[PDB]
Amino acid sequence: IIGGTECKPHSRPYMAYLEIVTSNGPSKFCGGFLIRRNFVLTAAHCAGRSITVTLGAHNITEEEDTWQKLEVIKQFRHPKYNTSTLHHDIMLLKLKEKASLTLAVGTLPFVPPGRMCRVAGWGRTGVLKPGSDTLQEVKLRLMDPQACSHFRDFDHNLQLCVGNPRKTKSAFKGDSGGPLLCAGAAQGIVSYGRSDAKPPAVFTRISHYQPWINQILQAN
Ligand SMILES: *[C@@H]1O[C@H](CO)[C@@H](O)[C@H](O)[C@H]1NC(C)=O
Ligand SMILES: O=C1NCc2ccc(Cl)cc21
Numbered sequence: 295i296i297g298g299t300e301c302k303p304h305s306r307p308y309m310a311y312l313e314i315v316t317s318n319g320p321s322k323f324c325g326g327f328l329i330r331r332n333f334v335l336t337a338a339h340c341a342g343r344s345i346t347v348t349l350g351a352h353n354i355t356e357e358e359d360t361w362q363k364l365e366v367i368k369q370f371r372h373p374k375y376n377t378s379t380l381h382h383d384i385m386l387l388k389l390k391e392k393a394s395l396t397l398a399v400g401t402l403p404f405v406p407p408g409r410m411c412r413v414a415g416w417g418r419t420g421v422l423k424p425g426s427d428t429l430q431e432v433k434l435r436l437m438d439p440q441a442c443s444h445f446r447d448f449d450h451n452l453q454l455c456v457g458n459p460r461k462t463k464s465a466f467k468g469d470s471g472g473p474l475l476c477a478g479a480a481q482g483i484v485s486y487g488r489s490d491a492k493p494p495a496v497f498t499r500i501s502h503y504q505p506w507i508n509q510i511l512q513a514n
């Protein structure tokens with residue numbers, strides 16, 4: 295998260311920290327959010343050979359009692375996710391068991407441009423900076439679709455355009471999969487943006503994927 299503030303520990307109890315394993319490289323990391331006690335929503339590009347989810351984290355380098363480290367049994371990447379257009383960047387993760395509900399861990403129960411939304415994550419705090427030890431959050435402005443025209447594959451139906459180009463505030467690498475909340479309700483999922491982090495950026499529009507989401511939650 296670029297240009298954000300460190301959150302008060304555990305004030306975002308639905309936040310999930312994902313460690314993703316691949317066969318041919320070291321671990322990678324993403325965000326995500328708990329929407330059922332055994333389901334986490336994240337971005338499809340965060341898929342890998344296997345994933346571990348940590349709930350209840352603030353400083354991800356110091357283990358504490360709030361932590362619940364949970365195995366992911368199955369990954370449900372959206373079947374139409376496209377590695378060229380980046381369309382349908384959404385994935386459900388089924389946890390091996392249901393998480394415990396604590397003060398630090400809970401689910402996130404399932405807008406005109408100009409609205410302020412917020413997004414949290416452990417991602418990099420600058421284009422050349424490492425991932426953040428702690429959960430940061432930033433408030434970002436919802437933009438008209440034309441603000442994102444330079445992303446040639448952007449689609450107003452499938453995606454949100456987020457971030458005032460006049461501010462340096464933005465999500466960045468490692469924040470992928472985290473929810474964008476507008477009015478305390480998840481509206482988007484961090485997906486992609488420019489490599490130099492100049493806003494706006496592109497978020498998955500959750501509402502478009504709701505039937506698919508409900509589908510997976512009923513068949514599993
Ligand atoms: C996070 O925890 C690590 C290990 O305890 C510590 O070195 C680091 O300074 C902490 N960062 C913050 C912002 O508290
Ligand atoms: O939101 C973003 N703006 C730039 C950017 C880069 C990478 C990722 Cl995962 C997200 C963003």
Ligand SMILES: [Zn+2]
Pocket residue numbers: 303304352358360
């Ligand atoms: Zn704590």
